[PDB]
Design a binder for this molecule. Structure first.
Ligand SMILES: Nc1ncnc2c1ncn2[C@@H]1O[C@H](COP(=O)(O)O)[C@@H](O)[C@H]1O
Ligand SMILES: Nc1ncnc2c1ncn2[C@@H]1O[C@H](COP(=O)(O)O)[C@@H](O)[C@H]1O
Lengths: 176, 176
């Protein structure tokens, strides 16, 4: 129901052609839809604290997730909520109690100001690779859609060298 | 219920500092919230055709809007819809019939593939300026907040020159 973890993320923007080629190299054919419902204050408090708050709806699950700065990478706090809980946070200015609330209070985020600001859809596939999780995302934003490759690892040094070598292996330039 | 118009609108991205200064400059105090709910096919058909399809929720009003290329700026087709019509489009992905649908069919969009992809909150202020309308936008996207100045004009040539001139006076670089 609730988990925390420290995660380090690398990300690279790729063309469709690069994306398809990399998918083919890893036998990625099926993608899973997810929708991210994001929150912020009118003053952008969370962005100011290098942090992000969202409810992810993926298959049957809603997960309230906070990402904040760690000494390196991010401290993630995840809390599975009900559909009714998720709807309530989107409709009204209440955040459910529990671990995410507790972290937001330590961050000194004016919790009552948090408002549901928007949403976006991602078609996602993951594979385990080297020190971590290689993620293939195709996301649909307001104006445009992107292809992205992410790599989530627990060891920064080796994770970074591994991601960079994978990109060079496939002739994909670094685009941050 | 239904209108069309050719809209000629220049846009420039600005920083938060530039934005606040420009607002003070123009005595812009009160902003109006809107939420845009955007639609696209998995193959990005709208975007490939220079177009966009969105339901705008502002105050108590919902407007289905298609923007498409014209010889100058964009041709917009707006259709006022009820809240329930709005929600059924979002939950079922079926676009209601009428002028937007008619235009979509002429563009040759595979309309049955259109899906609800996401939403975005924009805060907007306006003021009349040199025979045009100056628009101040602050939008809250998935992990950033974006500031824009826009200028809606009647004539492309002179509107351009007056927008570029405004930007120059406030030492705002051109950023499209
Ligand atoms: N602002 C909102 N208010 C109420 N319900 C919503 C809102 N956004 C999404 N939903 C609903 O909550 C569920 C999650 O939406 P989604 O993640 O967009 O599929 C769906 O059944 C939607 O119909
Ligand atoms: N994905 C969705 N599915 C069903 N209903 C929604 C969805 N998104 C928004 N709504 C509803 O439509 C109305 C407009 O939402 P908003 O424009 O997000 O304020 C609200 O009363 C919501 O409960």
């Amino acid at each position: 129901a609730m988990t925390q973890e420290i995660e380090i993320e690398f990300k690279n923007i790729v063309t469709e052609e690069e994306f398809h080629a990399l998918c083919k190299s890893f036998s990625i054919e099926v993608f899973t839809k997810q929708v991210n419902h994001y929150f912020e204050t009118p003053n952008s408090s969370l962005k100011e604290a290098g942090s992000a708050l969202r409810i992810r709806h993926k298959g049957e699950t809603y997960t309230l997730t906070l990402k904040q700065p760690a000494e390196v990478g991010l401290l993630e706090t995840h809390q599975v909520v009900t559909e009714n809980e998720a709807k309530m946070m989107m409709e009204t200015n209440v955040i459910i109690s529990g671990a995410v609330m507790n972290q937001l209070c330590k961050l000194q985020i004016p919790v009552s100001a948090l408002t549901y600001m928007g949403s976006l859809t991602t078609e996602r596939a993951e594979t385990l690779f080297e020190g971590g999780t290689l993620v293939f995302d195709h996301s649909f934003y307001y104006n445009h859609d992107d292809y992205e490759i992410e790599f989530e690892v627990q060891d920064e040094e080796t994770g970074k060298a591994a991601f960079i070598h994978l990109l060079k292996q496939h002739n994909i330039p670094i685009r941050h």
